[PDB]
Every structure is written in structure tokens, then in C-alpha cells.
Amino acid sequence: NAVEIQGVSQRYGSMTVLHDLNLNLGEGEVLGLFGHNGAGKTTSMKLILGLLSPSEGQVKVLGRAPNDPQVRRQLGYLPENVTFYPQLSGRETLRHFARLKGAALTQVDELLEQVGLAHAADRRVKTYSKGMRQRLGLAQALLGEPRLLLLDEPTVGLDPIATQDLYLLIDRLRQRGTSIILCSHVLPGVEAHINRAAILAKGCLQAVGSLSQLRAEAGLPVRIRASGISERDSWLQRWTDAGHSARGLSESSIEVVAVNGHKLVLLRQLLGEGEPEDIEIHQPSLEDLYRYYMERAGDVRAQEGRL
Amino acid sequence: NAVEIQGVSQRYGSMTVLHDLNLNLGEGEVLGLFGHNGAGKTTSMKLILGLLSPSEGQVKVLGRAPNDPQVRRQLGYLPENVTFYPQLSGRETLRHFARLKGAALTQVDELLEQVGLAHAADRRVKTYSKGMRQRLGLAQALLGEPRLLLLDEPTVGLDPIATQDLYLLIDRLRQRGTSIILCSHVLPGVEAHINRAAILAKGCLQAVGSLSQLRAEAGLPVRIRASGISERDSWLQRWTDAGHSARGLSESSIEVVAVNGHKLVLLRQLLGEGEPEDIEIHQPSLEDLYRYYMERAGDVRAQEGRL
Amino acid sequence: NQVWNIARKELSDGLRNRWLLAISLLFAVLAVGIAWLGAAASGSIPATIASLASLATFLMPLIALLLAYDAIVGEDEGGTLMLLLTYPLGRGQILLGKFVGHGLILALAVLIGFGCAALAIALLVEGVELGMLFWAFGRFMISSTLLGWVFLAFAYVLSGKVNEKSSAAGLALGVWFLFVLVFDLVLLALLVLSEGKFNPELLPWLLLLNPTDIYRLINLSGFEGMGVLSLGADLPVPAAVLWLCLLAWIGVSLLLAYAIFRRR
Amino acid sequence: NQVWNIARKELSDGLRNRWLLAISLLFAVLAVGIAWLGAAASSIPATIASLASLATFLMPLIALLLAYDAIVGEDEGGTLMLLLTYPLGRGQILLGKFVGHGLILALAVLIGFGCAALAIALLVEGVELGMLFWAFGRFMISSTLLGWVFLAFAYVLSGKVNEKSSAAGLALGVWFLFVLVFDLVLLALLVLSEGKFNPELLPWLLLLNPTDIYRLINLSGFEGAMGVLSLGADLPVPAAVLWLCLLAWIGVSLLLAYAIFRRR
């Protein structure tokens, strides 16, 4: 709906730096573009913008081509490691950008309060921090009524309190009907706030789905630590013959390592004894899926300690 | 014991930017220093390096003074953001630190074999990325087999494969017996790799302990994320009626903050009624503990998703 | 139009540059410095104005090259150039807005450099009959802006090509050496050696290839009274097109600046 | 020792500087250029008078190009915070940045003046070869010693400020001051003050600027295009002590940088 990509591919010379990318995006679903060695971490990111052209197919941003100014008036974008014009003041930097995007000038002093920059407004950009510039680079993306945000590493250098409510600002925005696209390298911290992932490598798309979808896709184990389980023996062996590994932790707790294709029906079996007693599930995270799909893309692991 | 900070109350200009921390550290322990909105983290990071003088306190590094030259051979440190030497080569700038720390010159080649930089070694550092500079700045901190590390956001700009492998390399040296101190702001993710956290605020130490120690101290709600439920609105009108601030993340995905008198038997409502496709129980994370340990001291939560 | 809206930034970014206010004050105090020492050594106006114009052969490129060498590549290191192309703009509206926005800076530099200096000259004779100076400096103020607007456009050609700010200044100091003090100096030696196969009488018929000589050609038009500038007195072309070729060195250089901006 | 180990970088850092390899070779072609025309004038004491004015304009400029980013370029580059965690002193990296930059300046004049010294062997066959060891040998151990003052001038200014761009604002600020200001204000005490402030303490006014002392040590026994150096025979100090004030102009101006670096 918001971003539709139909089979596009991109080449600098004749080598395909992006090959056969086919994405989709709804109106409220946020999306995590993750790449590390393929070019599509950034050349697909330019292709949502009007920075490049789809050399094979075509893209559709909000049902339109991404070079129209009516598209870009409702499109926010935040690049990584941006420093602004450092001799210019902070409030006039947004007042420069609000004139460019056609935003009303009443929105400028609200957004400096909305990113928490009113104490640091009317100061130079050279006397800002890294994350203090990142509040400013967020604030230009919130100009107007931005239907689409593209945030390439939005939380780098930020304060730890300032990271969390930024996602709540995103959760304010995606509940308001403006789908965003994230592009991070730090995978825990976006995985609690992403809605579906867009992991891709080697210039091609590897997998797109929810975090529930990829653990349904990838065969990847969980750890179900169930504390306080009584009777200790017949509830231990019943997971071993069912194709799983039950750890016999001797403090009345049974840790079942399963394959998660039978995830909820063992979880209903964990309420079948009547005393589950504050269980804990350890799903494999986003970076655990990222280690999987490089082997699916053929990128080998390192040695026992390399990087 | 590797690091023994005992009663250090650092001030200058009668400001008291660090007031009376008592921070110890073991040998194979890995520590996380977390601090913002003040000089709590960064001066205590400067105090352990010995480049800042301990005003009214002793900082016993390995039983010794932090400005001794023998303890600076057993120490490694990675700073904030090091654009090193943009006319030098990659092999030479690590060879420059090889003679400086006094390490052998048969270690500088294998560290560029270990950290994945040998394909881009003997190139100019102005041609390096931010991730390769953090790859480079790690390798000088690993140089000469140090017994104490100090990494200040080591994974910024880094490859997400190599982000995961760096904590394997830290756990390679945790099993060696060298204590590591992380000074991060990308704090979701480091909690699977640290052993104790050290959250400090306004120049004062708030809490030090493991995550089992912090969750036992700080009573936190438990996020029970469930995706793929039948009617999303039927539970958001019900979990708010049950006294839990529950919100939606897609057209069918809810998460429910718990109280742990309602984590167990109210989870039976989720399985047998309105069956999801996945239930992901989140533990109270170190990001969530940071919101608590801030709000003990000060800094009340920002309104309607600002900042 | 948003081409003015980016020019409101570069006007405000140019005036808050610390080096640009230093050189333009140093331009203005040397503008009166030729003027005061050209009046106290005299007692007229057009004899000293070529030495006044020889000051602007150095500084009006150096005002322009300090201001505009980091416009395209200085926003590419900052990353705002990648941000500005996502904004509803053309590529040329960035460049023409930077050219207008830097253009009214150094137009205002000669209105604070020459404008205090020439009005001091009318307030140091009192009987120079100041209405005749308006036809002198009005022929001189416009050319000083038209000189530096070429060197604005030569700054945008080099800053479109390079990939860093440090190598931008290596081309910025290269063009200020080559156009001001080398391309006249090669024509001194080209007078004395080129006579057998290459006739030097046919040499200055098409010497449009250095605009700072054309800046010196317009500022001695009818007020000669020199050295390498005597070769332009052999021109059978009128001086009205000597204006027009200097305005042509904007648009030839801006089209090279626009086409290099579309290759990023 | 640690102090050579930091110097082994800075020797290899200046040789990979694209800026310094330009103007050292521009010094080298200007050194042989005056020696070619000075041999064409045959004025052999007027050659060494003219070469000393060339190194007045360039050996401060090479030393300021080498070390304006020597301390503050480590601070905003982040290495200076790292370097004090190493087994070093604060002053141990200043001396190593001094010696490592200093041997570049010794290698600057040996490729600049030394080919120009042997340029006399190409054209003037029949000159006193033994006099040239006294002639150009007075240049090599003085132009370094002026250049080491401007290195220690640069460590004072790059230690104080906290921005690499603002260190360049004091780089040309100190380069205008000790080269093209202090000769002029001492000329203004001759002309505008008419010798009416104090006549008898005129010879003490030369030790507060090394660039005239560099002109004094090379024009010590040979007179010739003096100009502003008309107090050279007015000195009651012998030229053997004129070395020692220049060595004191290192050791004062180096130790003030270490006093700055102690409270950086």
C-alpha cells in the first residue's frame, strides 16, 4: 500500500548490486531493512527515495512514482551520521527545512519540544552532541504530515531514555496510520518495535515476514524455563520422547528445549499440570535469525573467536 | 579483584560531578556502565583510565595506581569515535600502537587476521568505514593480551554479524579471566553478555548487580507479547478492564504488561480463548530497568511520546 | 519558489562564516588603503582605480573561493546533500539557489568594500563633483560582482567533482593560483618566444580564456593613461561585448556546474 | 624509548601529507630559481640574502602546515584521549611530535636548499667550493632552527584551542604576525614615530621575532638588499649569541606548550 516494489533490480555497471527485490508495505506496519554485505541495505533505501531509478522494474511510493514532489511532501527521511550546517543555529535549521518541505512554520517550535531541543535551540549545530544532532535529524523527518519515514540508524548516539520513547513516538505514529521503515544494524532494540522484518543479503531478498513468521520459517530452537514444576520425573521424560530436550534442572524447574513447530501445544501442556509457576520462554532473537539467514545466503560463520 | 573504586567522590569547581561510588569488579566478570544526562558514566570511565585524577579517593587498578606504566600495558581501551590517522595505513597504525603499548610485532598481523580487516589492511584509514574503524580500534585494545578492557559503545556502525561475534570475543576473554567494562547506549543486547550492570545517574551510583539481582529488587511488569490472535479489540477492551496497559502492534498482535500475580492464570485465557500463532514472553529487560532506576532518582517520563 | 528558500539559508550561512567576515573586512580596509594612499599621493580618480581593480583581481576570487568551495561537497560530507535530494527539489534548484545565495553575499561584500571606499574618495576631494564618479564606479561595481560570480561558478565545478572537503581546497587553491597569477604570467613568456610558427599578433583576438584579464579589460576601458593589459588595446572589438563575454563565463561554467551535479 | 616511537609515526605521517609535499617541492623549485637567476646576475652575497627572504616566507609556512593539527587534530580525532591511556607521559608525546615533525623540516631544507646549493656546481664552475660549506652550511642549521620555533609556536596554538578549524585561524594569524607585521611595526617606529619614542633601546627590539634573527644570522658578515634590517650593524651582541637566542626561542616556546599540555 504505502511502499510497493515489483521485482526491481539495480546495476552500477553490469553487476547487479540489487537483484530481484520484491517488497510490500502496509499503511501502519513498520519494516526493518537489514543488510550487512549486500548493497540493498542502502541501494534499496535510496530506491524508496527518488535518488535512484529502478533499472529493471518500477517502485510505487503511496501509489505514485518516488520523484514527485507531492510524494516527498509527506515523506520523512533520516540518514545516518548526518551533521548539519554547523555555523547555523538549531531553530533556523528546522526553519530552513520547513520552508523546503512546505510545512507550516507553527510546526517548528512544536517539533523542537517534541524532540526535546528547546533548551538547545538557538545554539549552533557545532555545539551539539551526536545524539543531540539526531534529535534534530528526527525533527525534520516529522515535518508536515509525513506518511512515510525512513530512519537509517535513528538511535545512534542517543540517550537511553531518549531511545525508548522515540519508539513510542514511532508507536504513536504507526497507530496514527503512518508506516515507517527502519534501517538499523543494532538488532536488539529494534526487534521489540518492528512489525515485520526485511532481512536481505548478497544483493537479493532473503526473507520477509513477522518475527513470528521467521521463527515459523527457520527451524530454530527455543528455551522454555518453567520454574516450580512439581513431581520432577514423569514431567521430565515426557518431552524427551516427544522430540525435544528437557533439562533436568534440580531446583524443581524443567527447562524444555523444543523446535517451536509445536510451540503453543507444549505451552498448553505447560498449563496442563495446573502449576506452571512463572515460566520463562527464550525465543531466538533477531540477531539469532540474522546468523541463520547468512548461512541460507551462504555466508559462512567465523572461527571460535574472530570478530 | 581487578577494579577497586572505593569511595571516590570526584568534583571540580565545587560541582560534584561524581559523588561517592563504591564500584568493585571481579576477574572474569563483565560489567556494564550505563549513564546519561550528566557526567556519571564518562568521568567514571575517565577515572578508571587514570587520565583524570581521583579527588578524595583511591582507584586501585589490579591493586595498583591507575597512572602506573605497568598497568597500562595490561589495559585496553576503546574510545567514543576515533577517526585515527587518515593518511596512515591500516597495518601501520596498529603497528604504531604495537610499539607504544610494547607488544610484540608478531601480534599485530594476527589481530588483523582475527578482527576481519586483512582484506582491507594496508589501505588508507580515510578509506575506512565507521565499522572498520571500530574494527581497528578494537584491535589496539586487544593488543598485548590485556587483563582489563574498557569499551565505550564498541558496536556502533558495526556489522550485525560482527556485532554478535564481538561479544563472543569478549566472552573469549571473559573465559581468559580478563575483566571487561562496557560503556554502551545500545543497551538492549548487551544484557545477554554482561554479568553485572552498573546504572548510575546525576553523578551518583544508583544500582549495581546482576540482572537476577536487579529484577529481584525492582518489581517490574512482564511483557507478554502475543501475535496472531483472533480479535485484537476484544482483548484490548479486556486487558485494560483487567488492569493491564495493553496495546496493539499490528492488526492482530498484542502485548500485556503483567504483575506476576496475573502472569500465570491470565495466560490461560490467552491459550484456550482467542488462539494466537505465537506467544513471546519478554523478561523485564535492562532497558526496562533503566527506566525504573532513572525514575527512582529523577527525570519523569516524557508526555504523549515526545523527546 | 524554493530556489529562493534555499538561498535564505546560504545567505545566513555565509554571513555567519568567521573567515568570510575576516577577509571582507580585510578587503574593505585595503579598499580604502589604496584610496587614501592614492589621494594623499595625488593631491586623480582613474589613475589609481586600476590599482584598485588590481586588488579585486586577488580578493574577489578569494572571497568567492572561500565561500563556495564547500557548497556541494561540503554538504556531501555532512550528508545533508543526500537529505536535500529527498526533499521536493530539483537538482538544479539546489545549485542555482546556492549560486544566488552565495551571489548576494559577495555582491554585498563589494557594497561594503567599494561603497565605503568610493564615497570616502568623494568626501576627500570636495570638488571631484561626485556625480561623475557614479559613471566610474558603477562601471566598476558591476564588474566586481560579475568577476566573482564566475569564481562562484568555478567553485561549483570543482566542488561537484571532488569527494572530500580537503581535496576541494586543493583544487580551490589551484584555480586561484592558475587564473590570477599564472595565466597572465604564461602570456608574458608567450609574447617573447612565439613568433616563428605561431604569430603573436593573432594571439589576443580570442583571449577570452582568462576572465580576470577581462575584469582588467573592462576597468581600463577609456581610462588607460599596464604591462600584459596593453595587448587588449589591440582589440578591434568594442568594449560592450567585453562585458558580454564575462557574463558568458558564468553560464558556460554554470552549465558545467549543473552537469557535474547530475553525476553524483 | 617511547619518544622515538611516537616520532616514527609523525615522520611517516608528514611524508604522506599531500599538502606538505606540494609546498616543500614548491620551496625546492623556488630555491633553485633564485640560484639560477643569481648565477645569471654574475651578487653572490646577494644570492644568500635573497634565499633567506624566501625561507622567511616558507619555513614558517611549512612548519605551520605540519603542526597546526598536531595536538587538536589528535583531540577531535579522538586519539589523544586514547594516547594518554598508553604507557606515556603528556610531555612524552609532545617531544615525540616535535622531533618527528622536526626531522621533516630538516629533510625539507636538505631537499630544498641542498639541491640549490649543488645548483651552483651546475652553472658556476670556478667558484670557491670551500666557501659554500660556510655559505650554505649556515642556511641548513638556521632554517631548521627558525622552523623549529614555528613548530613550537604551533604546539602552543594547537594545544590551546579545541577546534581544528580554529587552529588554522591562529595558524595564519601567527604567520602574518611574525613575518608580515613585526617588520612593518618596527618600520613604523622608524617612519611614523620618527625615532622619537626611544633611540637607544632600538637594538633590544629584535629578539622578540625570530624571522629577523634568521635574516640577521645569514646577513651577519655580508651586507649586499637589506631594507628593514638597517639595525644589523647597530647590534652590540655578537652573532655567536644570535644563535643562542634562537635556541632560547625554541626552549621558551616549547616549554610553554608543555605547560599548556599539562593542563589540557
Residue pair B207/B214 in contact (Cβ under 8 Å)? The answer is yes
Minimal CA–CA distance to D102: which of D154, D179, D46, D158? D154
Give residue B163's Cα distance to chain centre: 12
Cα angle C24-C27-C32, degrees, rounded to a multiple of 5 = 130
Partner-chain contact A186 B172, CB within 8 Å: no
A280 DSSP β-pair partners: A225
Residue pair A21/A52 in contact (Cβ under 8 Å)? The answer is no
What is the DSSP pairing of strand B180-183 with strand B3-8? unpaired
A38 assigned binding-site residue: yes
Cα-Cα-Cα-Cα dihedral sign, residues C19, C13, A83, A122: positive
Q: Give me the residue label for grid cell 582605480.
A: C49
Residue pair A149/A182 in contact (Cβ under 8 Å)? The answer is no
Give residue A271's Cα distance to chain centre: 33
Q: What cell numbers appear for A265 in the block?
A: 501445544
Sequence letter at residue B185: H
Residue pair D250/D152 in contact (Cβ under 8 Å)? The answer is yes
A81 in contact with chain C, both atoms CB, cutoff 8 A:
yes
Residues of D in contact with B73 (CB under 8 A): 87
Q: What cell numbers appear for C127 in the block?
A: 570638488
Residue A166 maps to which CATH number? 3.40.50.300
D191 Cα to chain C: minimum distance (Å): 16
Exposure string of A275-289, with b = 16+ CB inside 10 Å and e = fewer, is ebeebbbbbbbbbbb
Using DSSP, state whether B7 is helix, strand or coil: strand
Residue D30: CB partners within 8 Å, gap ≥ 6?
D54, D58
Partner-chain contact B83 D78, CB within 8 Å: yes
Question: How far, CA to CA in Å, does B3 sit from each of B30, B201, D106?
Answer: 11, 20, 46
Residue pair D102/D6 in contact (Cβ under 8 Å)? The answer is no
Partner-chain contact B69 D77, CB within 8 Å: no
A92 in contact with chain B, both atoms CB, cutoff 8 A:
no
Question: How far, CA to CA in Å, does D31 sit from each of C177, D25, D64?
Answer: 19, 9, 19
The single-letter DSSP state of residue B89 is B
- Partner chains of A (3+ C-beta pairs under 8 Å): B, C
* Partner residue facing A100 (CB), from C12, C18, C89: C89
Residue pair D8/D100 in contact (Cβ under 8 Å)? The answer is yes
Residues of C in contact with A84 (CB under 8 A): 78, 80
B 236-275 residues with CB below 8 A of A?
247-250, 253, 260, 263-264, 267-268, 271-272, 275
Rounded Cα distance between A120 and A118, Å, is 5
C86 Cα to chain A: minimum distance (Å): 6
Could you list the residue range(s) of the whole structural domain that residue B10 is in? 3-216
Residue B73: closest C-alpha in chain D: D87
Rounded Cα distance between C31 and B252, Å, is 74
- Cβ-in-10-Å burial (0-12, 13-18, 19+) of C132 comes to exposed
Rounded Cα distance between D59 and D246, Å, is 14
Using DSSP, state whether B300 is helix, strand or coil: coil
Rounded Cα distance between A198 and C165, Å, is 35
Minimal CA–CA distance to B47: which of B25, B28, B27? B25
Rounded Cα distance between B70 and D86, Å, is 10
Using DSSP, state whether B279 is helix, strand or coil: strand
DSSP letters spanning chain A: --EEEESEEEESSSSEEEEEE--B--SS--EEEE-SSSGGGTHHHHHHTTSS--SSSEEEETTB-TT-HHHHTTEEEE-TT----TTSBHHHHHHHHHHHHT--THHHHHHHHHTT-TTTTTSBSTT--HHHHHHHHHHHHTSSS-SEEEEESTTTT--HHHHHHHHHHHHHHHHTT--EEEE-S--TTTTTT-SEEEEEETTEEEEEE-HHHHHHHS----EEEETT-SSSSHHHHHHHTTTSEEEEETTTEEEEE--STTHHHHHTTTTTSS---S-EEE---HHHHHHHHHHHTTPPP--SS--
Residues of D in contact with C21 (CB under 8 A): none
Rounded Cα distance between A31 and A182, Å, is 6
Rounded Cα distance between A61 and C166, Å, is 38
Rounded Cα distance between C227 and C222, Å, is 16
Q: At what angle do helices C18-39 and C2-15 cross, to 10 degrees?
A: 70
DSSP letters spanning C126-151: S-S-GGGTHHHHHHHHHHHHHHHHHH
Minimal CA–CA distance to A28: which of A232, A143, A180, A231? A180
- Side-chain-facing half-sphere of B196: CA atoms under 13 Å: 17
Using DSSP, state whether B206 is helix, strand or coil: strand
Rounded Cα distance between A305 and B168, Å, is 6
Rounded Cα distance between B53 and B59, Å, is 9
Minimal CA–CA distance to D4: which of A157, B100, C247? B100
Residue pair B280/B267 in contact (Cβ under 8 Å)? The answer is no
Rounding to the nearest 10 degrees, give the CA dihedral for residues A188, A189, A195, A196: -30
Minimal CA–CA distance to C245: which of C136, C146, C144? C146
Please name the method used to determine this structure: cryo-EM
Rounded Cα distance between C175 and C161, Å, is 14
Q: What is the distance in angstroms between the CA of the first residue and the CA of the last residue of chain C?
A: 24
Breaks in chain C after (C-N > 2.5 angstroms): 43, 225
The single-letter DSSP state of residue B34 is E
DSSP letters spanning D4-58: HHHHHHHHHHHTT-HHHHHHHHHHHHHHHHHHHHHHHH--HHHHHHHHHHHHHHH
Residue B130: closest C-alpha in chain A: A81
A39 assigned binding-site residue: yes
Sequence letter at residue A119: H
Residues of C in contact with D18 (CB under 8 A): 170
Rounding to the nearest 10 degrees, give the CA dihedral for residues B148, B153, B154, B160: 140
Exposure string of B157-169, with b = 16+ CB inside 10 Å and e = fewer, is bbbbbbbbbbbbb
Alpha helices, DSSP H, located in chain D: 2-14, 18-41, 44-67, 72-75, 79-83, 92-117, 119-123, 129-135, 137-160, 164-180, 182-191, 210-218, 239-262
Cα-flanking dihedrals φ and ψ of residue D233, to 5°?
-85, -10
To one decimal, the resolution in angstroms is: 3.7
Exposure string of C187-208, with b = 16+ CB inside 10 Å and e = fewer, is beeeeeeeeeeeeeeeebeeeb
C25 Cα to chain D: minimum distance (Å): 15
Q: Mutate which of B112, B149, B158, B161 to disrupt the A interface (most A C-beta within 10 Å)? A: B161
Q: What cell numbers appear for C92 in the block?
A: 538544479
Residue B7: CB partners within 8 Å, gap ≥ 6?
B20, B22, B56, B57, B58
Rounded Cα distance between B254 and B224, Å, is 8
Rounded Cα distance between C25 and C37, Å, is 18
Rounded Cα distance between B26 and C163, Å, is 48
Rg (CA), chain B: 23
Phi-psi region of A249 (alpha: psi -120 to 50; beta: other; left: phi over 0): beta
Residue pair B287/A189 in contact (Cβ under 8 Å)? The answer is yes
Q: What is the distance in angstroms between the CA of the first residue and the CA of the last residue of chain A?
A: 40
Phi-psi region of A231 (alpha: psi -120 to 50; beta: other; left: phi over 0): left
A185 assigned binding-site residue: no
Q: Where are the domains of chain C?
A: 2-261
Minimal CA–CA distance to A181: which of A76, A305, A301? A76
Question: How far, CA to CA in Å, does B242 sit from each of B72, C11, C171?
Answer: 57, 60, 70
Rounded Cα distance between B119 and A35, Å, is 20
Binding site for ATP: residue ranges of B?
Answer: 35-42
Residue A119, Cβ neighbours under 10 Å: how many? 8
* Partner residue facing A88 (CB), from C6, C12, C89: C12
DSSP letters spanning D146-163: HHHHHHHHHHHHHHH-S-
C83 Cα to chain A: minimum distance (Å): 7
Question: How far, CA to CA in Å, does A139 sit from each of A70, A127, A149, A256, B176?
Answer: 20, 18, 11, 46, 46
Residues of C in contact with A73 (CB under 8 A): 88
Q: Give me the residue label for grid cell 625539507.
A: D108
Residues of D in contact with B82 (CB under 8 A): 77-79, 82
Residue B138: CB partners within 8 Å, gap ≥ 6?
B78, B115, B151, B154, B166
Rounded Cα distance between B83 and B136, Å, is 10
C61 Cα to chain D: minimum distance (Å): 19
* Partner residue facing C87 (CB), from A83, A87, A101: A101
- Side-chain-facing half-sphere of B288: CA atoms under 13 Å: 15
Measured in residues, chain A has a length of: 307
Q: What cell numbers appear for C110 in the block?
A: 563589494
Minimal CA–CA distance to A116: which of A99, A136, A96, A97? A136
Sequence letter at residue A64: R
Residue B244: CB partners within 8 Å, gap ≥ 6?
B221, B256, B257, B258, B259, B262
Residues of D in contact with C19 (CB under 8 A): 169
Using DSSP, state whether C91 is helix, strand or coil: helix
Cα-Cα-Cα-Cα dihedral sign, residues A92, A94, A95, A96: positive
Cα-Cα-Cα-Cα dihedral sign, residues D155, D158, D164, D168: negative
Residues of A in contact with B300 (CB under 8 A): none
Question: Which uninterrupted H or E stretch holds B179?
Answer: none
Partner-chain contact A100 C18, CB within 8 Å: no
Long-range contact list for B292-301, CB < 8 A, 24+ apart?
A: B292/B218, B292/B220, B293/B199, B293/B201, B293/B206, B293/B207, B293/B214, B293/B218, B294/A161, B294/B201, B296/B206, B297/B201, B297/B202, B297/B204, B297/B206, B298/B201, B298/B202, B299/A161, B299/B37, B299/B201, B301/A165
